[PDB]
Structure 1
């Protein structure tokens, strides 16, 4: 992890970056801020290129579509909690997801959005914004406090609240047993495994493949090729405070063997991987959770 670039929010007493994602445009990074702005920065120079007001509270998460035409944002407490924006021609609002505090695109064909409202998953059509499906079964729920619904790589399956759903049939296929209070789990890009906190399960048999203690209370992301997994531990759950602690870990995504532990000695707000297994960007807070304001920087690392 060679540092390449660092920058703070331009012309700001304290810097308020809260999240990041690589643009479809080379050399440009999208950043959310604590005042609900979306900014485009040159990641090498640190120059601010564009700014748009998206939310009336901190942006917590953002996801660009692969083709560069659409963007999902989420905010902490304002209404709507999540939104879809068009980024061709004039930056515009396409749809609002009033009470969904987390959203993702579908993965294979990016024609749908999946939103989370507490224990409930909502699936929407991008074109119409219509809610197509609600996935929720009170009898199967794990009631994970930090539930996030997600599609699998082929968009055929959803994981919501530790329940595996077949989308087409809107059938609960399997409920994974609950071994933590918070984390609901994600699909491995390999399409064969799910990672639910410290447990790795096989989708073809439902057997436990691996225990990975270091993944406790972690969010994870993969590099472009799905050969490396990055994890960072959430802080246990007024301005937005650092969602993560000060370390992230890398793992071989084929065998879950630890590769590196990186303590950046600053609490982490977000991490994003590029689309070419080359660069990582990290939002790091110079300030503590007791500071009046956050004072974040974006570091670009070569991996």
Structure 2
């Protein structure tokens, strides 16, 4: 992890970056801010190239579509809470998801959005904006406090609140047992495994394949080739994470590195070629009057 670049938000006594993701154009990082702006930055110069007010509360998450034409945002305390934006020619709002705290695109064919409202998953069509499906069963709920619903790589299974759902049938196929209060899980990019906090489960057998005690309380992000997994641990204003991230080999779950950047982490992401890790670090403590975050770019 050799540091390659650092920048603060332009035109701010205090820098308010809260989350990031690389755009479909190399060199250009998309960042959300604590005032609910989306911003486009040159990741090398730190030059702000564009700006849009998406929400009147902080941005917690953003996801650009692979084809460069669409963007998902989530905010703290807005109605609507999440939204879908168009970025062809003009920046505009396409749809809004009135109480979803988190959203993702479908993975194989990016024609759907999955949104999370507490313990409930909503799937929407991108064209119509219609809610196609509500996935929720109160008898199978884990009530994870950081529940985030997600599609698998082929868009035909969903993980919501520790329940594996078959999208076509809208049937719960398996409830994974609850071993922590917060982390709900992700799909491995290989389509065969699910990572739920410290537990790695096989999707064909439901056997326990690995225990990874360093993944405890980590939000997991994969690189684009799916060879490496990055974990930032929940913190025990207030960042959602602590000041350390961990890397693991995605094939054998062996630890590669533990990096303490001595600054609470708000988000991290890789470019599509997996050359870079961009990390949003706060220079201020949780007690500061105001956030003062930087974006740090490291070469892996």
Cα distance, 1:145 vs structure 2: 1.3
- Distance of 1:17 and 1:222 partners within structure 2: 22
Cα distance, 1:294 vs structure 2: 0.5
- Distance of 1:26 and 1:125 partners within structure 2: 28
Stretches of 4+ moved more than 6 A in 1? none
Deviations 1:186-235 (A, max 9, x none): 00001000000100000000000000111111101111100000001011
Cα distance, 1:146 vs structure 2: 1.1
- Distance of 2:122 and 2:292 partners within structure 1: 34
- Distance of 1:295 and 1:151 partners within structure 2: 34
Unaligned ranges ≥5, structure 2: none
Q: How does 1:173-212 map to 2 (within 5 A)?
A: 173-212=173-212
Q: How many correspondences in the alignment?
A: 300
Unaligned ranges ≥5, structure 1: none
Matched, 1:166 2:171: no
RMSD over aligned CA atoms reads 0.6
- Distance of 1:79 and 1:280 partners within structure 2: 32
1:275 alignment counterpart: 272
Deviations 1:234-283 (A, max 9, x none): 113xxx52111000000000010000001101000000111001011000
Secondary structure of the equivalent of 2:191?
coil
Cα distance, 1:11 vs structure 2: 1.4
2:105 alignment counterpart: 105
1:129 alignment counterpart: 129
- Distance of 1:12 and 1:122 partners within structure 2: 36
1:301 alignment counterpart: 298
- Distance of 2:225 and 2:250 partners within structure 1: 10
Deviations 1:47-72 (A, max 9, x none): 00000000001000000000110000
With normalisation by structure 2, the TM-score equals 0.99
- Distance of 1:195 and 1:249 partners within structure 2: 15
State whether residues 30 and 38 of structure 1, in contact with CA within 8 Å, keep that contact through their aligned partners in structure 2. Answer: yes
State whether residues 241 and 294 of structure 1, in contact with CA within 8 Å, keep that contact through their aligned partners in structure 2. Answer: no
State whether residues 21 and 64 of structure 1, in contact with CA within 8 Å, keep that contact through their aligned partners in structure 2. Answer: yes
- Distance of 1:148 and 1:38 partners within structure 2: 22
- Distance of 2:112 and 2:102 partners within structure 1: 14
- Distance of 1:74 and 1:298 partners within structure 2: 19
Matched, 1:266 2:252: no
- Distance of 1:293 and 1:155 partners within structure 2: 40
- Distance of 2:273 and 2:107 partners within structure 1: 17
